[PDB]
């Protein structure tokens, strides 16, 4: 509106007052995305971007928030003439979605760093004319809500955002850019990306938000970071309390990564009487299995990262094996580089460092070490197997020799007597990838044949002539 009922809690003087506003909006037929994003962006600005003069909490006065809200609605309503886009059947047209996208896009500053922190909210859009990639998609949805377009909703993969709209909510439209140096596809469907089985479009198992999930998205989008070394405790608390509010209302049920975010916040500062982080990570994985065909990678990464921080090598390896079992059924496509980077860093930095410490602890007499557990060797092998299977049939390759030395080193952290205990069948493990099937006979030698492993992992045809 803003409607009278939306104004009664102002001024917001504390974290808890912001939570009360979110609770009130989430109890309405349609929570007001523009109001909520402006409030979060205002408090984030004064808690993380500029803390000069902060004494407790940046009071959000109604006059200030209402003026920002009016700037947004005036910009959208003045620029989008709905009479040019008649709404057949109470649903929106592709041309109307494209117009809203164009209005947001054309408002942005001509040159700025797109990966900056704190450019996600409508506060940033209004005051700085800057948005990050997914911020543009959220702003399009908020503008559509402000215009009365109840069918336009945010769609989210694990690395991109777009909109759904139209009859039955069945149309898709790109509304923002993805990554750096890719060609704009605004206004097009996501069908080519779904059909090519890229990770970017999740084989179609992406999130189709309702309004409550769009509120969850903006809460996950809070960025508490003040600088590289410092987070705002106030914004961490706000994000944590808002995620618990959403959790209790059922609005995280279909949002795996939000459950992982909540688990990470609980690990940092547990809330008495709430579930443990592990329970929450497992709920995020359950959500992905239940609603998204177990086609998401990050729920397992969140779990693996917790185990890795807790130096629980066995369960970290299991969770990484599970990430690879998801990725194996994708084709590695152009624009999937973010997930390639995660696997590369896990394989070639994180696992090596974890196993190096495990080896030192084993030398010092550790008992029950992952390095003496053949099931942990099997998890390592299953991790590589899924990456090799991912590569099969893909338009771009995954493995190269820069992976091969780390594989040889990690395999060799397990003594041959441990490695011998895994039965590879066509502790028991079955390989899905042809690369790992051919590597089987190299996996039990006391001194692994490093050159042969490298040949098998990279499918290198030849050794040096001379
Ligand atoms: C909360 N809601 C939420 N979150 C989203 N993305 C989150 C994805 C996970 N990251 C953290 C992160 C990043 C890498 C990690 C782990 C855990 C592990 C593990 N193991 N790794 C791999 C590592 C270990 C490494 N190296 C040294 O340690 C990092 C390699 C973790 C938790 C934070 C953002 C998105 C994206 C959307 C699409 C958009 F809208 F944006 F278009 S919607 C949306 N919603």
Tell me what the structure shows:
By secondary structure, the protein is mainly alpha-helical. It has one domain. 53% of the residues lie in helices and 5% in strands. The protein contains 20 helices and eight strands. Strands 3-2-1-4 form a four-stranded antiparallel β-sheet, covered by helices on one side. Strand 1 (153-156) and strand 2 (161-165) form a beta hairpin. Helix 2 runs parallel beside helix 10 (233-249). The longest helix is centred in the last third of the chain and has 27 residues, at 337-363. The chain is globular. The site of the ligand CNc1nc(NC2CCN(Cc3ccc4c(cc(C#N)n4C[C@]45C[C@](NC=O)(C4)C5)c3C)CC2)c2cc(CC(F)(F)F)sc2n1 has 21 residues, from helix 11, helix 13 and helix 15. The PDB classes it as protein binding. The entry lists the keywords Menin-inhibitor complex, protein binding. The assembly is monomeric. The entry is titled "Menin in complex with MI-3454". The protein: Menin.
Task: Provide a brief overview of the structure.
The PDB classes it as protein binding. The chain is mainly alpha-helical.
- Tell me, briefly, the overall form: globular
Instruction: Please write the string of helix (H) and strand (E) elements.
Output: HHHHHHHEEEHEHEEHHHHHHHHHEEHH
| Chemical compounds bound to the protein | ligand LMY
Structural class of the secondary elements? mainly alpha
Work out the strand percent: under 5%
Note the gap between the termini.
Answer: 78 Å
Tally the structural domains: 1
**Physical arrangement of strands within the biggest beta sheet:** 3-2-1-4
């Amino acid at each position: 509106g803003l409607k009278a009922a939306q104004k009664t809690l102002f001024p917001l003087r504390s974290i808890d007052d912001v939570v009360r506003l979110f609770a009130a909006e989430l109890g309405r037929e349609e929570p007001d995305l523009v109001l909520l994003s402006l409030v979060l962006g205002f408090v984030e600005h004064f808690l993380a971007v500029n803390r000069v003069g902060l004494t407790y909490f940046p009071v959000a006065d109604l006059s200030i928030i209402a003026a920002l809200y009016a700037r947004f609605t005036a910009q959208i309503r003045g620029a989008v003439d709905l009479s040019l886009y008649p709404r057949e059947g109470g649903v929106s047209s592709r041309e109307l979605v494209k117009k809203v996208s164009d209005v947001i896009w054309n408002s942005l500053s001509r040159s700025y760093f797109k990966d900056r922190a704190h450019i996600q909210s409508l506060f940033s859009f209004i005051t700085g004319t800057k948005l990050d990639s997914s911020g543009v998609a959220f702003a399009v949805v908020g503008a559509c809500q402000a215009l009365g377009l109840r069918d336009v909703h945010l769609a989210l993969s694990e690395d991109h955002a777009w909109v759904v709209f139209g009859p039955n909510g069945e149309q898709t439209a790109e509304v923002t850019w993805h990554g750096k140096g890719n060609e704009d596809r605004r206004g097009q469907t996501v069908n080519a990306g779904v059909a090519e089985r890229s990770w970017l479009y999740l084989k179609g198992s992406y999130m189709r938000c309702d309004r409550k999930m769009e509120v969850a998205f903006m809460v996950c989008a809070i960025n508490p970071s003040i600088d590289l070394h410092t987070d705002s405790l106030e914004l961490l608390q706000l994000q944590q309390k808002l995620l618990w509010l959403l959790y209790d209302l059922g609005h995280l049920e279909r949002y795996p990564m939000a459950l992982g975010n909540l688990a990470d916040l609980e690990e940092l500062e547990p809330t008495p009487g709430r579930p443990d982080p592990l329970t929450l990570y497992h709920k995020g994985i359950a959500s992905a299995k239940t609603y998204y065909r177990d086609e998401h990678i990050y729920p397992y990464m969140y779990l693996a990262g917790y185990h890795c921080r807790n130096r629980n090598v066995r369960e970290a390896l299991q969770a990484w094996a599970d990430t690879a079992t998801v990725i194996q059924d994708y084709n590695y496509c152009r624009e999937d580089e973010e997930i390639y980077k995660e696997f590369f860093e896990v394989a070639n930095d994180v696992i090596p460092n974890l196993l190096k410490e495990a080896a030192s602890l084993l030398e010092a007499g550790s008992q029950g070490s992952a390095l003496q557990d053949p099931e942990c060797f099997a998890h390592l092998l299953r991790f590589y197997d899924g990456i090799c299977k991912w590569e099969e049939g893909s338009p771009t390759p995954v493995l190269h020799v820069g992976w091969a030395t780390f594989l040889v080193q990690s395999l060799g952290r397990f003594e041959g007597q441990v490695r011998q205990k895994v039965r590879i069948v066509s502790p028991v493990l079955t390989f899905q990838s042809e690369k790992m099937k051919g590597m089987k006979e190299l996996l039990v030698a006391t001194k692994i044949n490093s050159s042969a492993i490298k040949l098998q992992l990279t499918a290198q045809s030849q050794v040096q002539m001379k």
